[PDB]
Specification:
The complex is a heterodimer.
Chain A: E1 13-17, E2 23-27, E3 33-34
Antiparallel strand pairs in A: 1-2, 2-3
Chain B: no helix or strand
Classes of the chains: A mainly beta, B little secondary structure.
PDB class: ligase/signaling protein
Keywords: WW domain, Notch, NMR solution, complex, Ligase-Signaling Protein COMPLEX
Assembly: dimeric
């Protein structure tokens, strides 16, 4: 439950957590990646 | 944003 029944995921995105203790975002639509959730635009 | 870390590579690693 405690990390498997949390709130809904963002639209058409993936979100991962590295062994360094940091969080990253992944766009399957263009194979792009980023450190945060910025405005839509240039890479 | 300076500070190199573990690079995120999902689809870009499994291809």
């Amino acid at each position: 439950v405690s990390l498997i029944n949390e709130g809904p995921l963002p639209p058409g995105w993936e979100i991962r957590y590295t062994a360094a203790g940091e969080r990253f975002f992944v766009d399957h639509n263009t194979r792009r990646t980023t450190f945060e959730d910025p405005r839509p635009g240039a890479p | 944003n300076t500070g190199a870390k573990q690079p995120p590579s999902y689809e870009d690693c499994i291809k």
